Curated annotation (Swiss-Prot), chains A, B:
Belongs to the Gfo/Idh/MocA family. Pathway: Carbohydrate metabolism. This is D-apiose dehydrogenase. Mg(2+) binds at residues 21-22, 24, 27. The keyword Oxidoreductase applies. Involved in catabolism of D-apiose. Catalyzes oxidation of D-apiose to D-apionolactone. Substrate binds at residues 95, 162, 175, 179, 229. SUPFAM superfamilies: Glyceraldehyde-3-phosphate dehydrogenase-like, C-terminal domain, NAD(P)-binding Rossmann-fold domains. It catalyses: D-apiofuranose + NAD(+) = D-apionolactone + NADH + H(+). GO terms for molecular function: metal ion binding; nucleotide binding; oxidoreductase activity. It comes from Rhizobium rhizogenes (strain K84 / ATCC BAA-868). Keywords: Carbohydrate metabolism, Magnesium, Metal-binding, NAD, Nucleotide-binding, Oxidoreductase.
């Protein structure tokens, strides 16, 4: 009955994906793969996976799975997606999708030629509060949107769980802004032009931890995407994205604690848009953790019905172009044309 | 000794300036001037002013005053400042200072040549909550500021009291953004480069009612100035400017209802930064109305002691440049160098 998955990269975040695969209806994990045998045993023993591999090439050679879930760091994404396409195995790939837009496009083209689905595991838009904002806007409750702010400002120690974040020359846009830019696209549509500024505040890291981005959307809306991992607040908001939308007939204000305020022609409503806390989830990650179940169930449903996923490889190019444009803009000082990159 | 003022432009907003001049210690109004004799009659009778002039030329010829308060619309500012300079009368001039940066510079030059003070009545930085943000940041409570947001988003019918606002090709940056940009300078210092976007949402007006501006400050800080008169919120925030500042050791958050959250190395504090309610004030103008008294007392103190004012003509050029740069940037789509304009 169930689709049989193979997960590659049994790291920090993969533990969440494994829990979710148990919960997903119509799919489960039949095999795992990791370069590190300490991680291979730890995850293998925790989830009771009999089939365990030290390298992906051997995994693919044995086969016996219907899809692959790639939860490695960015360095091995291109090779693993290319291995999947050559073996005709539908593939999920973690963010950041690739090291460059050029690599991403090549990965998309290879999967399109192999006639296999490719979904980027881009789960921020699958969060309950973000879904709620989308539903309000699509309902026409505030009319046509003309302005947005999408803000993730945190002082959370992401570096403990994910030490590589402190080492790269590139940090926040590639790691976190990739989500916030995707949310901006999800809510207000594709971007025409982009302008960005960056800064490093934290002395203990190599790369930028503050980014401010100004988006000119194709539909005429303007938005601000502002991200920071050097923001010291009284109440730590991690991992909440706060959202303001202004429209011709109203406003949406998603504020701290998942408070969703909507003003329209017929007054003003307030609702709790907080996530469900799953049995295996853990504060403060529970928002992200629920969205892992949401996107993996989405993948599983779309693989059966044969439709395109929401954050497909093809879709995600238009998010990834913004990340690369933001770095270009921050260095050059100039506004970047997004259409010309694609 | 009591300083004697002449006020020119007995319009909508000048009634507030007249109330405030009564409350000011060390100064009062001895003469008024307006081309419209209905306004001259109404304001003259209300405030008991015997000396009433149909034109400024005659007012200056008769003299008998130590300073002039110009509360007309922008069209007549340059001429009235020039008349003040030639008659060696210290001058206050309402915003917008001039029609262009070029006119503003000439006005500043003429007053410097005549050895008379020139202050722009730029009263937003003189609001109690804005003064509190400045005082917190100057104290060192949050370390060195690196990022800010300054936001004035409203659905208030400013067009009732000020109908001309609906008629101009230019609207919100010139009318309101001029204040918000001044606050950005006041808090985070002078600006090196600037990028702006504008649009018109309201179908009943000629000019732009939404503007979003990205500032690169000379000290390294980045800020967003976002203004709108087409924002429909459950609670109308007019005329509050909301302010976020991030620093190396903390944050300032000035939110709706004048609530001031400051978090630093010691902990979080919440303060009530609400304005006073003067005897002659009216909701919802009371915050602005208090600041009119503050700036007019400031003028009076500085004129009496021979100091320079905070929003002197010379200082205000660095605000006004940002307004002209924002219009330029919004039309061309290009980043504008502020230094090159001054
Ligand atoms: N919200 C989210 O969706 C979210 C949250 C955190 C991290 N992430 C992303 O997930 C990815 C993984 O992050 P992480 O913190 O778990 O990394 P990690 O370093 O903890 O784990 C990666 C694992 O993959 C293994 N690996 C690397 N290359 C391999 C290869 N070629 N074959 C087999 N195994 C290989 C490593 O041994 C390691 O155990 C990153 O790209 C990150 O951006 C996403
Ligand atoms: N926060 C603030 O400080 C604030 C608030 C509102 C308005 N304003 C500014 O105040 C100015 C006036 O606004 P308003 O709404 O009172 O305008 P208004 O049209 O109501 O008043 C202007 C008055 O000046 C008179 N006038 C014009 N040219 C003249 C001349 N050459 N000689 C004599 N009289 C002349 C007109 O007859 C009119 O009565 C504007 O520049 C506006 O931007 C500032
Ligand atoms: C945790 C993070 O890597 C962003 O910092 C994520 O993708 O959720
Ligand atoms: C009212 C206003 O003109 C801004 O819209 C002012 O200057 O206070
Ligand atoms: Mg399952
Ligand atoms: Mg007085």
């Amino acid at each position: 009955t169930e689709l049989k998955g193979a997960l590659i990269g049994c790291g920090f975040f993969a533990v969440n994906q494994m829990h979710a695969w148990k919960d997903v209806k119509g799919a489960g994990i039949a095999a795992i793969c990791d370069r590190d045998p300490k991680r291979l045993k730890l995850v293998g023993d925790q989830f009771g996976i009999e089939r365990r591999y030290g390298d992906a090439a051997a995994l693919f050679a044995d086969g016996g799975f219907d899809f692959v879930d790639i939860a490695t760091t960015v360095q091995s994404h291109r090779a693993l997606v290319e291995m999947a396409a050559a073996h005709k195995v539908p593939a999920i790939c973690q963010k950041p999708f690739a090291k460059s837009l050029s690599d991403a496009k090549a990965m998309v083209r290879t999967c399109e030629n192999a006639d296999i689905p490719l979904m980027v595991h881009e789960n921020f838009r699958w969060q309950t509060p973000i879904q709620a904002v989308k539903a309000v806007l699509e309902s026409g409750a505030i009319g046509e949107p003309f302005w947005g702010r999408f803000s993730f400002r945190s002082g959370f120690d992401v570096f403990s769980g994910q030490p590589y974040l402190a080492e790269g020359e590139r940090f926040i846009i590639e790691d976190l802004g990739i989500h916030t830019l995707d949310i901006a696209r999800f809510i207000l549509g594709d971007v025409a032009t982009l302008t960005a500024r960056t800064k490093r505040v934290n002395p203990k890291i190599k790369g930028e931890d503050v980014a401010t981005i100004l988006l000119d959307h194709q539909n005429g809306a303007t938005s601000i995407v502002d991200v920071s991992y050097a923001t010291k607040l009284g109440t730590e908001p991690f991992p909440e994205t706060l959202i303001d939308i202004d429209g011709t007939q109203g406003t949406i204000r998603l504020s701290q604690g998942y408070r969703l305020e909507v003003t329209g022609p017929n007054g003003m409503t307030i609702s709790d848009a907080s996530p469900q806390l799953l049995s295996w989830a853990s504060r403060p990650w529970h928002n992200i953790q629920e969205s892992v179940l949401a996107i993996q169930q989405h993948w599983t449903d779309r693989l059966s019905s044969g439709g395109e996923t929401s954050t497909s490889g093809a879709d995600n190019l238009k998010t990834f172009a913004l990340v690369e444009a933001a770095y270009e803009s921050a260095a050059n000082g100039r506004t970047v044309d997004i259409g010309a990159m694609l």
